[PDB]
Amino acid sequence: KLWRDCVNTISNEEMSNELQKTNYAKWATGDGLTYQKIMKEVAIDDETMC
Amino acid sequence: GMNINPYFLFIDVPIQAAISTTFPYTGVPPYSHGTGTGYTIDTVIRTHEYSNKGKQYISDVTGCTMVDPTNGPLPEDNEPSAYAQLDCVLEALDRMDEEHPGLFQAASQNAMETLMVTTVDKLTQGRQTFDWTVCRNQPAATALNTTITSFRLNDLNGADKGGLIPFCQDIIDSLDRPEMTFFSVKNIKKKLPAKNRKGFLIKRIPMKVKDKITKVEYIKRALSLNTMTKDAERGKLKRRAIATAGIQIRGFVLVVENLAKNICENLEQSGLPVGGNEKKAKLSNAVAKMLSNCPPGGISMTVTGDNTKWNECLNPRIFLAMTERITRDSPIWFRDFCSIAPVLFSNKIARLGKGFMITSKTKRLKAQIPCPDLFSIPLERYNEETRAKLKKLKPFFNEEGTASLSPGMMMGMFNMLSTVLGVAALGIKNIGNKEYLWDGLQSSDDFALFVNAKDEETCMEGINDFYRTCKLLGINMSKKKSYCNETGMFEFTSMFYRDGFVSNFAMELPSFGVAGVNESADMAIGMTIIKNNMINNGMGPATAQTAIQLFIADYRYTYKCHRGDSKVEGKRMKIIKELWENTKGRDGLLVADGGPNIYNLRNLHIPEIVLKYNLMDPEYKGRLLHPQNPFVGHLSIEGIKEADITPAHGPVKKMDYDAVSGTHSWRTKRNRSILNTDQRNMILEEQCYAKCCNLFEACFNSASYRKPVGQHSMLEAMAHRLRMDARLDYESGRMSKDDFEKAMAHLGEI
RNA sequence: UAUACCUCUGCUUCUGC
RNA sequence: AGUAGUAACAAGAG
């Protein structure tokens, strides 16, 4: 779907080469995978956090 | 199928001849990610691991856990050893004074006389320095200013006198103060009139607050070292930790290093502080003599050597003994001066970086654990590697989140003085009047020992003695990395010898690219690097001509300044294409304005602006070199000629180039990350000093060129000058009666 | 909480001799 | 996921 999106977006009549942030593009680029930062006080209180 | 093997070149060409092909310097150097606490703690443990059989005591000053290996029991294994015996150092030092007559008192004099002339501003020319006030690394120039302003509150105005001696006298005295006050800017709201619905606006003004700390806290902060990890360190798999020093210690190191530097210059068997061709010239002659002096019908052997755990073993208390011996004839005030720097390193404290990051993979969360909160968490949540380290750190760990590191030289800084201790070993030359004669070279940790004897059986026995001699000074030779062979070829500080030092082009290869100062500067640097490599590092004219090609490529893409006739599309290239059409003398256009590249082997030494000046249009050269153009700014004497270069071996040395000051000689915007942090307040603080200095330079134009001298007020100077300027302009008749009275009126208020 | 599909940032959350 | 490799990023902040 991403390859097809590329071939479609690169083939179109538009000036821009931008790609819409689709479900497949988001997965492919790996969207919002960063671990959420929390306070030291909560992290030290939490046991599962190692 | 024909299976190509690259090593098969070594069958035809010898390793040294084609050593350049054993250096992967087209590739990416190793960088560090996240924290360096695990690397620092490792160093902290390993430093004490080599000193654990010494004497452990508690500092009555700091209240820390200290370890003293010096004059400890001698080792019974090949494991690194800090157990250096004082007598064996003093003997080796004595042996140096015998071999080099009256060098110590001569070197002491030169340093002592220099110390008197040394100004306080000598501490500005440094890299990122630890600032005790804010407890973060900052530029040396600021880190100095923050200390001077802080010392003025606690009433220590030795800095004002101009000399470094009274400022150093203040630093050791500042330890005696019971409380040390320092400014800590804190924001305050303030209504200001505006054209709002409610005609006003709130602007958060900075206000300086007097914050105090106890006698003990300051003493520790003064002895504290801030730790990181060595980034871009070549030819290394795993990473290692380094440290930055405070403004207090930096004063005394400068003198002791300058002292050892004076000795090293005059010592024959030292690779420092000489460099470049001068270094080769020395080592060549040294090698020629050490070769041709050997007994006929014998064997001369060169040990291609290296010392492992250099900084981790060498003790400050040995370095203290070294200064006391060197300053024996010099007066008592200088003896005590040189004794401080080692005394500070002897009771130094290590800051353990950021800390450790803990994460739940399921929850997908993360959080940094500050160094003071390392034992807040049960050690079951840390991984095996860190768990073991943290337990071994425990008996050295302080509650504030630091480690007492009495042994070792975490940061280093003593390179010249550490070389001398190495030379002292090379000075002994024999033990027990045996049938061998050793003598080597020293570049801090790096060494190359020559041995002349009857047969090789004798040579190795002679090397075995050097190894056992170095153990008593605290120098551990690396059995792993070090190797031996019959004289003719050897390695010393990435310089390869084979009946003469062989060319190694790969070491200087990274420098050929765009250095990243600006368009006009980088062009000069680029060619100056090419022409200097043709000379020193043996680059043939074909490769040299290609190095010019490959530069203009990297230059044109980096600064997006391709030829005018070329139809490569880009925001800038659009105006470049118009300039090409507008301009008649297109050969006169610079490469940065989409002009042609006219450089070749011969004219590398001439600036681009000078080469083309005659070929330029009269309008274009006017624009390019407009005296009052907005791009260039207030040029500093260093800002025009000099610029930084980072070669993969030694410290960052600033080389000088030749370029004409034109529109292309611009500066880049400041890092704007500061705007979002609480550091904002420093922006105002800067622009305040900026006004004062810029107005002082308007009164005294020579201030930009040569450093202004005077212990009097900065206003007092500006007042008296502008008073005279007005008086003389009136009597000469440049100033009118209307303006003179107004001038004398305004100055009357001051 | 709310403004916030808004605003600021890209070496300035520690780069030594 | 992936980069990467003894520890991080896979955006941060008001």
JSON list of N, CA, C and O (backbone and C1' of nucleotides) in Angstrom, two decimals, chain B residues 127 230 250 411 413 415 671-673 676, chain C residues 8-17:
[
{"chain": "B", "resi": 127, "resn": "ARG", "atom": "N", "xyz": [38.05, 25.31, 27.05]},
{"chain": "B", "resi": 127, "resn": "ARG", "atom": "CA", "xyz": [36.82, 24.64, 26.55]},
{"chain": "B", "resi": 127, "resn": "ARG", "atom": "C", "xyz": [35.77, 24.64, 27.67]},
{"chain": "B", "resi": 127, "resn": "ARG", "atom": "O", "xyz": [36.03, 25.27, 28.72]},
{"chain": "B", "resi": 230, "resn": "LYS", "atom": "N", "xyz": [33.59, 9.79, 25.82]},
{"chain": "B", "resi": 230, "resn": "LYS", "atom": "CA", "xyz": [34.41, 10.22, 24.65]},
{"chain": "B", "resi": 230, "resn": "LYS", "atom": "C", "xyz": [33.68, 9.83, 23.36]},
{"chain": "B", "resi": 230, "resn": "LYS", "atom": "O", "xyz": [33.64, 8.63, 23.04]},
{"chain": "B", "resi": 250, "resn": "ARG", "atom": "N", "xyz": [41.86, 24.76, 37.52]},
{"chain": "B", "resi": 250, "resn": "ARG", "atom": "CA", "xyz": [42.38, 25.12, 36.17]},
{"chain": "B", "resi": 250, "resn": "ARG", "atom": "C", "xyz": [43.51, 26.14, 36.28]},
{"chain": "B", "resi": 250, "resn": "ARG", "atom": "O", "xyz": [44.43, 26.08, 35.44]},
{"chain": "B", "resi": 411, "resn": "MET", "atom": "N", "xyz": [40.53, 12.83, 34.73]},
{"chain": "B", "resi": 411, "resn": "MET", "atom": "CA", "xyz": [40.49, 13.85, 33.65]},
{"chain": "B", "resi": 411, "resn": "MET", "atom": "C", "xyz": [41.80, 13.82, 32.84]},
{"chain": "B", "resi": 411, "resn": "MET", "atom": "O", "xyz": [41.73, 14.04, 31.62]},
{"chain": "B", "resi": 413, "resn": "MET", "atom": "N", "xyz": [44.88, 15.91, 32.12]},
{"chain": "B", "resi": 413, "resn": "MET", "atom": "CA", "xyz": [45.35, 17.32, 32.14]},
{"chain": "B", "resi": 413, "resn": "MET", "atom": "C", "xyz": [46.88, 17.38, 32.26]},
{"chain": "B", "resi": 413, "resn": "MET", "atom": "O", "xyz": [47.50, 18.13, 31.48]},
{"chain": "B", "resi": 415, "resn": "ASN", "atom": "N", "xyz": [49.73, 15.96, 31.06]},
{"chain": "B", "resi": 415, "resn": "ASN", "atom": "CA", "xyz": [50.31, 15.18, 29.93]},
{"chain": "B", "resi": 415, "resn": "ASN", "atom": "C", "xyz": [51.83, 15.36, 29.94]},
{"chain": "B", "resi": 415, "resn": "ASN", "atom": "O", "xyz": [52.55, 14.33, 29.92]},
{"chain": "B", "resi": 671, "resn": "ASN", "atom": "N", "xyz": [21.86, 29.21, 18.50]},
{"chain": "B", "resi": 671, "resn": "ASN", "atom": "CA", "xyz": [21.00, 28.09, 18.96]},
{"chain": "B", "resi": 671, "resn": "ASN", "atom": "C", "xyz": [19.88, 28.67, 19.83]},
{"chain": "B", "resi": 671, "resn": "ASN", "atom": "O", "xyz": [20.20, 29.31, 20.85]},
{"chain": "B", "resi": 672, "resn": "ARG", "atom": "N", "xyz": [18.62, 28.45, 19.43]},
{"chain": "B", "resi": 672, "resn": "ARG", "atom": "CA", "xyz": [17.42, 29.13, 19.99]},
{"chain": "B", "resi": 672, "resn": "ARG", "atom": "C", "xyz": [16.71, 28.24, 21.02]},
{"chain": "B", "resi": 672, "resn": "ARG", "atom": "O", "xyz": [15.66, 28.67, 21.53]},
{"chain": "B", "resi": 673, "resn": "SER", "atom": "N", "xyz": [17.27, 27.07, 21.33]},
{"chain": "B", "resi": 673, "resn": "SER", "atom": "CA", "xyz": [16.75, 26.13, 22.37]},
{"chain": "B", "resi": 673, "resn": "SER", "atom": "C", "xyz": [16.70, 26.83, 23.73]},
{"chain": "B", "resi": 673, "resn": "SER", "atom": "O", "xyz": [15.81, 26.50, 24.53]},
{"chain": "B", "resi": 676, "resn": "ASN", "atom": "N", "xyz": [13.40, 28.49, 25.41]},
{"chain": "B", "resi": 676, "resn": "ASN", "atom": "CA", "xyz": [12.34, 27.65, 26.03]},
{"chain": "B", "resi": 676, "resn": "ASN", "atom": "C", "xyz": [12.72, 27.27, 27.47]},
{"chain": "B", "resi": 676, "resn": "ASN", "atom": "O", "xyz": [11.80, 26.98, 28.25]},
{"chain": "C", "resi": 8, "resn": "C", "atom": "P", "xyz": [5.75, 30.46, 16.62]},
{"chain": "C", "resi": 8, "resn": "C", "atom": "O5'", "xyz": [7.01, 29.93, 17.47]},
{"chain": "C", "resi": 8, "resn": "C", "atom": "C5'", "xyz": [7.72, 30.87, 18.31]},
{"chain": "C", "resi": 8, "resn": "C", "atom": "C4'", "xyz": [8.37, 30.12, 19.44]},
{"chain": "C", "resi": 8, "resn": "C", "atom": "C3'", "xyz": [9.53, 29.18, 19.07]},
{"chain": "C", "resi": 8, "resn": "C", "atom": "O3'", "xyz": [10.73, 29.90, 18.80]},
{"chain": "C", "resi": 8, "resn": "C", "atom": "C1'", "xyz": [8.09, 28.09, 20.57]},
{"chain": "C", "resi": 9, "resn": "U", "atom": "P", "xyz": [11.54, 29.27, 17.56]},
{"chain": "C", "resi": 9, "resn": "U", "atom": "O5'", "xyz": [12.12, 27.89, 18.18]},
{"chain": "C", "resi": 9, "resn": "U", "atom": "C5'", "xyz": [13.08, 27.97, 19.27]},
{"chain": "C", "resi": 9, "resn": "U", "atom": "C4'", "xyz": [13.49, 26.57, 19.67]},
{"chain": "C", "resi": 9, "resn": "U", "atom": "C3'", "xyz": [14.22, 25.74, 18.61]},
{"chain": "C", "resi": 9, "resn": "U", "atom": "O3'", "xyz": [15.62, 26.02, 18.65]},
{"chain": "C", "resi": 9, "resn": "U", "atom": "C1'", "xyz": [12.49, 24.45, 19.63]},
{"chain": "C", "resi": 10, "resn": "G", "atom": "P", "xyz": [16.42, 25.94, 17.26]},
{"chain": "C", "resi": 10, "resn": "G", "atom": "O5'", "xyz": [16.67, 24.35, 17.07]},
{"chain": "C", "resi": 10, "resn": "G", "atom": "C5'", "xyz": [17.58, 23.67, 17.97]},
{"chain": "C", "resi": 10, "resn": "G", "atom": "C4'", "xyz": [17.96, 22.33, 17.40]},
{"chain": "C", "resi": 10, "resn": "G", "atom": "C3'", "xyz": [18.35, 22.31, 15.91]},
{"chain": "C", "resi": 10, "resn": "G", "atom": "O3'", "xyz": [19.38, 21.35, 15.64]},
{"chain": "C", "resi": 10, "resn": "G", "atom": "C1'", "xyz": [16.54, 20.88, 16.25]},
{"chain": "C", "resi": 11, "resn": "C", "atom": "P", "xyz": [20.88, 21.90, 15.50]},
{"chain": "C", "resi": 11, "resn": "C", "atom": "O5'", "xyz": [21.53, 21.56, 16.95]},
{"chain": "C", "resi": 11, "resn": "C", "atom": "C5'", "xyz": [21.29, 20.25, 17.50]},
{"chain": "C", "resi": 11, "resn": "C", "atom": "C4'", "xyz": [22.22, 20.00, 18.67]},
{"chain": "C", "resi": 11, "resn": "C", "atom": "C3'", "xyz": [21.96, 20.83, 19.93]},
{"chain": "C", "resi": 11, "resn": "C", "atom": "O3'", "xyz": [20.88, 20.31, 20.70]},
{"chain": "C", "resi": 11, "resn": "C", "atom": "C1'", "xyz": [24.29, 20.72, 19.47]},
{"chain": "C", "resi": 12, "resn": "U", "atom": "P", "xyz": [20.06, 21.45, 21.48]},
{"chain": "C", "resi": 12, "resn": "U", "atom": "O5'", "xyz": [21.15, 22.08, 22.50]},
{"chain": "C", "resi": 12, "resn": "U", "atom": "C5'", "xyz": [21.69, 21.25, 23.56]},
{"chain": "C", "resi": 12, "resn": "U", "atom": "C4'", "xyz": [21.95, 22.09, 24.78]},
{"chain": "C", "resi": 12, "resn": "U", "atom": "C3'", "xyz": [20.76, 22.91, 25.31]},
{"chain": "C", "resi": 12, "resn": "U", "atom": "O3'", "xyz": [20.74, 22.82, 26.73]},
{"chain": "C", "resi": 12, "resn": "U", "atom": "C1'", "xyz": [22.55, 24.36, 24.83]},
{"chain": "C", "resi": 13, "resn": "U", "atom": "P", "xyz": [19.26, 22.95, 27.33]},
{"chain": "C", "resi": 13, "resn": "U", "atom": "O5'", "xyz": [18.55, 21.50, 27.11]},
{"chain": "C", "resi": 13, "resn": "U", "atom": "C5'", "xyz": [19.34, 20.34, 26.71]},
{"chain": "C", "resi": 13, "resn": "U", "atom": "C4'", "xyz": [19.97, 19.71, 27.92]},
{"chain": "C", "resi": 13, "resn": "U", "atom": "C3'", "xyz": [20.90, 18.51, 27.64]},
{"chain": "C", "resi": 13, "resn": "U", "atom": "O3'", "xyz": [22.23, 18.95, 27.40]},
{"chain": "C", "resi": 13, "resn": "U", "atom": "C1'", "xyz": [19.25, 17.88, 29.22]},
{"chain": "C", "resi": 14, "resn": "C", "atom": "P", "xyz": [23.18, 17.83, 26.74]},
{"chain": "C", "resi": 14, "resn": "C", "atom": "O5'", "xyz": [23.91, 17.17, 28.04]},
{"chain": "C", "resi": 14, "resn": "C", "atom": "C5'", "xyz": [25.34, 16.90, 28.01]},
{"chain": "C", "resi": 14, "resn": "C", "atom": "C4'", "xyz": [26.10, 18.08, 28.57]},
{"chain": "C", "resi": 14, "resn": "C", "atom": "C3'", "xyz": [27.56, 17.82, 28.97]},
{"chain": "C", "resi": 14, "resn": "C", "atom": "O3'", "xyz": [28.36, 18.99, 28.90]},
{"chain": "C", "resi": 14, "resn": "C", "atom": "C1'", "xyz": [26.34, 18.36, 30.89]},
{"chain": "C", "resi": 15, "resn": "U", "atom": "P", "xyz": [28.70, 19.51, 27.41]},
{"chain": "C", "resi": 15, "resn": "U", "atom": "O5'", "xyz": [30.31, 19.51, 27.36]},
{"chain": "C", "resi": 15, "resn": "U", "atom": "C5'", "xyz": [31.04, 18.35, 27.85]},
{"chain": "C", "resi": 15, "resn": "U", "atom": "C4'", "xyz": [31.95, 17.81, 26.78]},
{"chain": "C", "resi": 15, "resn": "U", "atom": "C3'", "xyz": [32.53, 18.83, 25.77]},
{"chain": "C", "resi": 15, "resn": "U", "atom": "O3'", "xyz": [33.91, 18.57, 25.56]},
{"chain": "C", "resi": 15, "resn": "U", "atom": "C1'", "xyz": [31.54, 17.06, 24.61]},
{"chain": "C", "resi": 16, "resn": "G", "atom": "P", "xyz": [34.83, 19.85, 25.28]},
{"chain": "C", "resi": 16, "resn": "G", "atom": "O5'", "xyz": [36.00, 19.68, 26.38]},
{"chain": "C", "resi": 16, "resn": "G", "atom": "C5'", "xyz": [35.81, 20.25, 27.70]},
{"chain": "C", "resi": 16, "resn": "G", "atom": "C4'", "xyz": [36.77, 19.61, 28.68]},
{"chain": "C", "resi": 16, "resn": "G", "atom": "C3'", "xyz": [38.26, 19.78, 28.38]},
{"chain": "C", "resi": 16, "resn": "G", "atom": "O3'", "xyz": [38.73, 21.05, 28.81]},
{"chain": "C", "resi": 16, "resn": "G", "atom": "C1'", "xyz": [37.80, 17.53, 28.96]},
{"chain": "C", "resi": 17, "resn": "C", "atom": "P", "xyz": [39.98, 21.60, 27.95]},
{"chain": "C", "resi": 17, "resn": "C", "atom": "O5'", "xyz": [41.19, 20.63, 28.42]},
{"chain": "C", "resi": 17, "resn": "C", "atom": "C5'", "xyz": [41.99, 20.98, 29.57]},
{"chain": "C", "resi": 17, "resn": "C", "atom": "C4'", "xyz": [43.32, 20.25, 29.48]},
{"chain": "C", "resi": 17, "resn": "C", "atom": "C3'", "xyz": [44.17, 20.56, 28.24]},
{"chain": "C", "resi": 17, "resn": "C", "atom": "O3'", "xyz": [44.91, 21.77, 28.39]},
{"chain": "C", "resi": 17, "resn": "C", "atom": "C1'", "xyz": [44.05, 18.22, 28.55]}
]
